[PDB]
Nucleic acid binder design. Structure first.
Ligand code: ZN
Ligand code: ZN
Ligand code: ZN
Ligand code: ZN
Lengths: 93, 107, 97, 101, 82, 101, 93, 107, 83, 95
DNA sequence: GAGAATCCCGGTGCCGAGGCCGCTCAATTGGTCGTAGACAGCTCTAGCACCGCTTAAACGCACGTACGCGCTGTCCCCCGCGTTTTAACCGCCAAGGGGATTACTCCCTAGTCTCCAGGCACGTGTCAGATATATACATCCTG
DNA sequence: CAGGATGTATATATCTGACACGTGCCTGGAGACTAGGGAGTAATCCCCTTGGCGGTTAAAACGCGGGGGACAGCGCGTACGTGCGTTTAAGCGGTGCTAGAGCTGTCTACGACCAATTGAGCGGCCTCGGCACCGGGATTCTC
């Protein structure tokens, strides 16, 4: 059956960053594993935060705090900036 | 009702809808907010963009046009923050950094 | 005839294996070792090719990291040769022993 | 390995049990080396057996021996992690009770 | 059969190659035996976890997913296999 | 202690092998439950089942021969308790080996 | 507001194993933390197992597999045995 | 009918019902089987019994009738399996085991 | 008043006592400074995680629960203070 | 007058048989507050939070000192040096 | 300077990366409904700031000594390399085991309601132990 | 080897504050019953794994000469342990304020759930360009 993955989105980001550069199958598998690992890390952190504060919802604030806890330094700062920009764009549109 | 995808609405390439479905079915919490999938997708997109940019730089410094696990490993371990994030992560076919301790070299 | 002094060929091998990225252990011996070890847990076990490939990749990465730590211990002990005492120190500090 | 039966063991007939009612006599020093605890040098009580070596001890003796000294067998120096490396032996408990009540 | 005495499958040149990739210039004689023992312990742990996963799955083939899950439990998460 | 005299029939339930019905010859014990049988009996039974004959406790996952050990203490115990056991066993051994070289 | 804890149960187990030995408040807190940590570890492993096998229910088989995965050696063996007897006794009623 | 606790039904001292509630409300799975809490309660009870037995034995050696964090630490660290289970666990007021390297011993 | 040079409060006798508990017989002179730096880094990391937890909690006080949660996050899980 | 090393061994035994905290409470609390001032101003700290932080700090430092002593013994010395700590942390993965 | 290793340049081929097409199933849109929690308000508690007294402990300094750091000498044991051998690897084949899929049904657990008792907060008597003092024994150091 | 000095575990006596036990109660656990979907079971397809066979070497195994590094012994001088007097501030105990943790009521907006739908994304196919490998010079490293 269908086995979903982030291959097309990773390819879109790769074309956005380096228009003339492609990727291999093993590298796409590496990127898929990385995206899944980071997704599960952030989601588990947000779930732990929500349980810790007796909250039944995972919101943008929980995701932001999870990102700040996990990512170090400049990566965390820029990830928070990108997430905030996406959130405001969503609420504006 | 002209259907507009949430990823395009938030200006993201990553699948906001798929992330939201994974948040529902991931057994993380009883309910998941509306902005959480967009925020998580933006974070994933930024991390992917940084990793792919560094890998492409490594490949261009190798005079190839296809990103390989060797280039990905070089980028990850040459970025200090990315290496700290992926300290326990082992990339298949990644190899090791070219380095030798100074005492091992003649002078 | 031409003879290289000790250490030069070792450094050349270090450079070539650090630049290159293929697997260093032999596929069939590693697969047989994996099957022999798995004989203790279940019987008539089967392995996918990707399973033994992942096992070999993880084992080689672990051994390379352990050898890096062992070389650091040997250099700290004012030596160039790795030693079983160096390996034991590295494992004990990492918490594997 | 180390378990292949010999030529004799392939067909050895069972030892017929003595079913007739004859009594056997035993001196108080007959089974000393077999029923003596290596720690307390006394008769066993609440027998525990190590898995790796099949060596018999009293429960309290072996518990204090492991808790204080090293995690090795008092007899054969083979290592045992904790009390879970030993099991009680009701067969030896029954033997002790019937022989010396 | 039994499949006995196969740990020596890892050869001394193989261990030397791994050490060279690890940046080691000089290798002692007992390093090979020590590395064989360490690799045997590591493989025992990882394969034990993988076989436990497979047995819980009611399957008979150890999968790359099972190996990846075992390594992730051990803190040694592996990328590239899913 | 004093000299003890006790009936053999009272000791048969603790010195007999369940699989063969006879006395313990070359006693071998499974360590997951500490159950003793004759070496030939338990070894022969172990090619057809991976479970203990008595309490049905799984002796091992794959190779049950990995969790059986020689019960030397119990073997000398049954030799001392049963009169003529050692001599009778050696007699059958030499008689069997008197015809096959 | 009541703050639930395993204090009474750990005390009952302590009275079962060592009738004449009491416990301190710090020891009770440490034991409660240990019980909570083992609970969350086993539950998380069972959840991961169910997610990997695409099963929506946590069963005794999942709990047994999690116990086998986390506890080492003899601890795992004895815990599995104890859980098996407990489940058999509960279902035989 | 008369109410009989599931802990008494399973012959356990630990709260099978509370464990079931924590599993259900802990966001671990969509559904939780009936036999799942009993097994987990039994495992928790056995682990608690082992640790308490070792700590009480240590207290009896130290001529004390009260289990303290020092006794708990001695019990945990003197057992290899318990130490591996709690390798990353820090016990407050537990101290460390008495251990001096032989090289530091006087000659 | 912003506190300053309070790392100097981590005394040389205290570092020596910690080393003695660690089984150290002889201590060099630079060990004290190195240990002060290492302790400062470790405290910075743990306190940063705890303060982040507190900020998410919409609170202005760091609690023992937040400290324990940060330690569990960093693999240094601590018993005796709840959780 | 005792020879060097004997008092050190006595202190090792005494501090290994005891469980009390080895860092002074008020200086450690002041250090914690100073460090936390860089993250959020006008913070408050629970006494239990400070005690937990101190227990974690002592445990981490004692483990690091054990590893450092092992490194020093490996280097054929009984004196610990900063490079021992650096090697221990590098092997652990903290640097 | 001789010789081995490796980089730079040009050909060739091959195989899988990327683009295109068809389908399908899940993400969108719209609406309803239930409740999570946002917000305001109140309580009370424990965290902060200050004080003063006592003495535990840190600081500074003197001094001896033992141990870290060269320095040398030796000897033995990995290294480099040549020759032999051996089984890994690639390609190909063939069989069937079981992983994966689909359909049916059944029974097991979420859910709701009612009832009641198990555990939690609280209070109190009591004894385990931290502390104090004295003493005899084990370690250690020097003459 | 012995005697002095010091640290430490042993033997009693205090008194006390934390612990074990009694109690009210109320909220969460237990009994009963329903239903609907998850999972167990049966049948089937074909993917892929196991097993084998034949060359072809790449690579492993063995042996040998030897140079360099590990190990040991030696010497020194400096940095650290030990001890003592002094100075610093930690610890204790009580006081007082109050910012903020924690609990509660309301009602409101936000998220789950359901129906229809359609377009993004996945499976399959095809082709052509990037890369592996080939070989030949040219440069670099080594001895
Ligand atoms: Zn005894
Ligand atoms: Zn033994
Ligand atoms: Zn028999
Ligand atoms: Zn049995």
């Amino acid at each position: 059956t269908r086995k979903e993955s982030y291959a097309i989105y990773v390819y879109k980001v790769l074309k956005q960053v380096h228009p003339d550069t492609g990727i291999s199958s093993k590298a796409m598998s590496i990127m898929n594993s990385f995206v899944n690992d980071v997704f599960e890390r952030i989601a588990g952190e947000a779930s732990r935060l929500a349980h810790y504060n007796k909250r039944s919802t995972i919101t943008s604030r929980e995701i932001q705090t999870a990102v700040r806890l996990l990512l170090p330094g400049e990566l965390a700062k820029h990830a928070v900036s990108e997430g905030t920009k996406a959130v405001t764009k969503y609420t504006s549109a | 009702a002209k259907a507009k995808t949430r990823s395009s609405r938030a200006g993201l390439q990553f699948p906001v809808g798929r992330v939201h479905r994974l948040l529902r079915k991931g057994n993380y919490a009883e309910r998941v907010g509306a902005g959480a999938p967009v925020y998580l997708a933006a974070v994933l997109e930024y991390l992917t963009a940084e990793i792919l940019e560094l890998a492409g730089n490594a490949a261009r410094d190798n005079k190839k046009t296809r990103i390989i696990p060797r280039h990905l490993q070089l980028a990850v371990r040459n970025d200090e923050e990315l290496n700290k994030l992926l300290g326990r992560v082992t990339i298949a076919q990644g190899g090791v950094l070219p380095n030798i301790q100074s005492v091992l070299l003649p002078k | 005839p031409h003879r290289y002094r000790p250490g030069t060929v070792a450094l050349r091998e270090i450079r070539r294996y650090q630049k290159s990225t293929e697997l260093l252990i032999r596929k069939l011996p590693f697969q047989r070792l994996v099957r022999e070890i798995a004989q203790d847990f279940k019987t008539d076990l089967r392995f996918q090719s990707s399973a033994v490939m992942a096992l070999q990749e993880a084992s080689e990465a672990y051994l390379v990291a352990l050898f890096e730590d062992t070389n650091l211990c040997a250099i700290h002990a004012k030596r160039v040769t790795i030693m079983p005492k160096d390996i034991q120190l590295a494992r004990r500090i990492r918490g594997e022993r | 390995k180390t378990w292949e039966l010999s030529l004799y063991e392939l067909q050895r007939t069972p030892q017929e049990a003595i079913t007739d009612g004859l009594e056997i006599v035993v001196s108080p020093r007959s089974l000393h080396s077999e029923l003596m605890c290596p720690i307390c040098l006394d008769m066993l009580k609440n027998t525990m057996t190590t898995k790796e070596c099949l060596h018999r001890f009293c429960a309290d003796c072996i518990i204090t021996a492991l808790r204080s000294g090293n995690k090795e067998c008092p007899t054969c120096r083979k290592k045992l992690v904790s009390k879970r490396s030993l099991r009680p032996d009701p067969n030896f408990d029954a033997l002790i009770s019937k022989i010396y009540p | 059969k039994v499949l006995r005495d196969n740990i020596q499958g890892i050869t001394k040149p193989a261990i030397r190659r791994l050490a060279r990739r690890g940046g080691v210039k000089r290798i002692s004689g007992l390093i090979y035996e020590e590395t064989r023992g360490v690799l045997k312990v590591f493989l025992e742990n990882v394969i034990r976890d993988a076989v436990t996963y497979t047995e819980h799955a009611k399957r008979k083939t150890v999968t790359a997913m099972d190996v990846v899950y075992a390594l992730k439990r051990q803190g040694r998460t592996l990328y590239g296999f899913g | 202690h004093r000299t003890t005299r006790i009936k053999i029939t009272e000791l048969n339930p603790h010195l007999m092998c369940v699989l063969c019905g006879g006395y313990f010859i070359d006693a071998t014990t499974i360590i997951e439950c500490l159950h003793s049988f004759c070496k030939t009996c338990i070894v022969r039974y172990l090619e057809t089942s991976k479970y203990c004959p008595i309490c049905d406790v799984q002796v091992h996952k794959t190779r049950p021969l990995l969790n059986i050990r020689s019960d030397k203490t119990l073997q000398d115990i049954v030799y001392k308790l049963v009169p003529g056991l050692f001599k009778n066993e050696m007699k059958r051994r030499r008689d069997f080996y008197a015809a096959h070289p």
